[PDB]
Design a protein around this ligand. Structure first.
Ligand SMILES: [Zn+2]
Lengths: 673, 75
């Protein structure tokens, strides 16, 4: 005698919450997968938390949470039904007959709450476009008047870029329309809608979206013109300027250590996930990796992008971003979530040996630090085609002024051997305090590897400052080797024979009277050990010009915070220290302990883990920034898989035979066996 | 204390700093020496971006550390 629908429904009624205005209802995509109402099997919406789950995953929420009642959606035109677990009883929206009214009213109230031609412009042919227009860039526009960065109209008469209209509360600061009002210039185009196929053209005059057959030419006025499959060959949908994320993420998941942490171990991860898994780092990263290394038109990683960008000034927006910045951001995010567990960052991490030498005394100091990316200098003076480039720049200057077709592109051809040299070369440093000399002098700084990583990450420093401090991309050609021997670059530490650079009242009134500064005068009595006026006079005379640090004299917490830190994998004592160092600020305290633990462990030892190996590499992958601008561009990556090179351009994944390994930006070198 | 900043020339400079100095302070100390506007500075230490409103002591930046300046290639 089986359990009736009504019985089961009445029994978990209290777990039916009805959503409100300020409520996220995850109705469009599954928490654990990329399943959608459009997937066969549909989407199950927990009617308690409003979270969504595909058919293979609902059972996870059931078991973890107790929730039996789900609103099941299937789009193909949408078909909705209530389903109770574990036996999958179905009740339709109109299956509530005979139940008490107050339950019918609760159930439908909840369900309803969960489910919440252009003509040509009269002015297209008559349009006067003003002379000497500005050169409008491909991205990153702002309203010429306020600050707004979305919703901007380009007026086709004068090149002005101004924000849209307000009403409701959403929109712009009305700058664009007031500009039309003042001028009469009828047409504007919505910046960012400009594809090869058309744009959104608005007519202030006709109060309408309109067509403009001459758009190409009107935009041209402003200098605007309009295969692999299977596991490990997934494309990533553009989410609007997400190419940088796509490119990084594609390389990460080609690296076995990241595969083992987040993809091989996804079951364990899904199991250990909290109630809302959409908000869980490990889950989201795992979900992304799985969707790339199995079978799946590509994937749209909205959920991941939303989470790893949360609270970030750049990665929470939808504008164009730097690949290295994203990479380090995700790396440090992995670091935060992998303290005392499997840490895939270990594959990148290495030790830099920094050496100072006081040139005058020949005395040395060796310092040491962790890093993830080696920054490769690009010494322009090494360019092999200085003159071939100067004829190019002349021809381009000429072609711009005449508004003709630009010449075929030429880049400064810089040897890699030169970059590597520049990395290694000893470097002169001025205004250096030598504790040996006790005088400002000049040091010789050198950088070496105290450790070579399993995968070496290289950033080509292909940028510099131009005039008026505008950043210039160095559009340069550097053939990065398929084979890298970086062993000559291993640090050797302090050596025998090498000497180390050293480190660390009635008198005061009499000296300040004489004309010596109070600060020097204080340090004088202290460092002569109170031996009377004479000895202190002698000291200020030697040492008054010294920098402060050369002769220094030093002259309640919350429990919700503590537990948050300890949950990241630290002790209570460690958490307290961090907060007490960071004036009780959570974010800073977290920065504190991570940067301080390695030192705190050495006080524990008083009573950072890196993988070493040969510095002998093979090119594995590179991320390429395309364009001439610092401010706009497109990112793609090339990855060597199964012996053969592959380009991943957002949605498009193709075998490439001729990888442009000389135009890349961030390079990934895998260590040889 | 003394620290080092590698600039985008290649040139390494020294700065007089205290552990309690903010990043924007260090940024300002860079303008003072090099002329580089603080709004154009992005500083990297030990594989980590340094954010405004944090001190050098939050990152455990000690005497004679090397910080690196970088620029964005937006795309
Ligand atoms: Zn505006």
């Amino acid at each position: 005698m089986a359990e009736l629908s009504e019985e089961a429904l009445l029994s978990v009624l209290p777990t039916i919450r009805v959503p409100k205005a300020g409520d996220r209802v995850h109705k469009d995509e599954c928490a654990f997968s990329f399943d959608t109402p459009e997937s066969e099997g549909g989407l199950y919406i927990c009617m308690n938390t409003f979270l969504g789950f595909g058919k293979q995953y609902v059972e996870r929420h059931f078991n973890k949470t107790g929730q039996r009642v789900y609103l099941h959606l299937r789009r193909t035109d949408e078909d909705v039904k209530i389903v109770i677990l574990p036996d999958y009883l179905e009740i339709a929206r109109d299956g509530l007959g005979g139940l008490p009214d107050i339950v019918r009213d609760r159930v439908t109230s909840a369900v309803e709450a969960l489910l919440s031609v252009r003509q040509v412009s009269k002015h297209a042919f008559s349009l006067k476009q003003l002379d000497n227009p500005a050169r409008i860039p491909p991205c990153g526009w702002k309203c010429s008047k306020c600050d707004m960065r979305e919703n901007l109209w380009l007026n086709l008469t004068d090149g002005s870029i101004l924000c849209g209209r307000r009403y409701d509360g959403s929109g712009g600061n009305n700058h664009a329309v007031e500009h039309y009002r003042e001028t009469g210039y009828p047409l504007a185009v919505k910046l960012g809608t400009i594809t090869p196929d058309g744009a959104d053209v608005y007519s202030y005059d006709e109060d309408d979206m309109v067509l403009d057959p001459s758009l190409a030419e009107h935009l041209s006025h402003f200098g605007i013109d309009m295969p692999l499959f299977g596991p490990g060959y997934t494309g990533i949908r553009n989410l609007g300027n997400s190419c940088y994320l796509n490119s990084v993420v594609q390389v990460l998941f080609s690296i076995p250590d990241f595969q083992r942490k987040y993809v091989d171990k996804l079951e364990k991860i899904f199991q250990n996930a909290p109630t809302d898994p959409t908000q869980d780092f490990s889950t989201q990263v795992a979900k992304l990796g799985h969707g790339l290394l199995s079978g799946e038109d590509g994937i749209a990683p909205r959920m991941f992008k939303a989470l790893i960008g949360k609270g970030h000034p750049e990665f929470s927006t939808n504008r164009q971003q730097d690949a290295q910045e994203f990479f380090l951001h995700l790396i440090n995010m992995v670091e935060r979530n992998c303290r005392s567990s499997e840490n895939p960052n270990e594959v990148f991490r290495f030790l830099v040996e920094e050496k100072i030498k006081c040139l005058a005394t020949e005395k040395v100091k060796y310092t040491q630090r962790v890093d993830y990316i080696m920054q490769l200098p690009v010494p322009m003076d090494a360019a092999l085609n200085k003159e071939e480039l100067l004829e190019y720049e002349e021809k381009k200057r000429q072609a711009e002024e005449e508004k003709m077709a630009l010449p075929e592109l030429v880049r400064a051809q810089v040897p890699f051997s030169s970059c590597l040299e520049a990395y290694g070369a000893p470097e002169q440093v001025d205004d250096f305090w030598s504790t040996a000399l006790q005088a400002k002098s000049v040091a010789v700084k050198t950088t070496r590897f105290a450790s070579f990583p399993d995968y070496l990450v290289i950033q080509i420093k292909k940028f510099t400052f131009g005039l008026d401090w505008v950043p210039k991309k160095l559009d340069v050609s550097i053939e990065m080797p398929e084979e890298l021997d970086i062993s000559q670059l291993r640090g050797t530490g302090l050596q025998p024979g090498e000497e180390e650079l050293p480190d660390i009242e009635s008198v005061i009134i009499q000296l300040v009277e004489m004309g010596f500064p109070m600060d020097a005068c204080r340090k004088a009595v202290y460092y002569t050990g109170n031996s009377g006026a004479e000895a202190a006079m002698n000291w200020v005379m030697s040492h008054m010009d010294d920098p402060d640090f050369a002769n220094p004299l030093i002259l309640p917490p919350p429990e919700d915070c503590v537990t948050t830190i300890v949950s990241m994998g630290f002790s209570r004592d460690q958490a307290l220290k961090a907060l007490r160092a960071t004036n009780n600020s959570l974010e800073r305290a977290v920065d504190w302990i991570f940067s301080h633990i390695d030192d705190l462990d050495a006080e524990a030892a008083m009573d950072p883990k890196v993988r070493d190996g040969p510095g002998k590499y093979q090119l594995f992958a590179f991320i390429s920034h395309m364009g001439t601008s610092t401010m706009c561009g497109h990112y793609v990556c090339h990855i060597k898989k199964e012996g053969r090179w592959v380009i991943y351009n957002d949605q498009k994944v193709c075998a490439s035979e001729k990888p442009p390994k000389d135009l890349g930006y961030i390079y990934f070198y895998q260590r040889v066996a | 204390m003394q620290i080092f900043v590698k600039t985008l020339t290649g040139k390494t400079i020294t700065l007089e700093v205290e552990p309690s100095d903010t990043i924007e302070n260090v940024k300002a100390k860079i303008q003072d020496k090099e002329g580089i506007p603080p709004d154009q500075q992005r500083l990297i230490f030990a594989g980590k971006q340094l954010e405004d409103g944090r001190t050098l002591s939050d990152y455990n930046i000690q005497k004679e550390s090397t910080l690196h300046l970088v620029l964005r290639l937006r795309g």
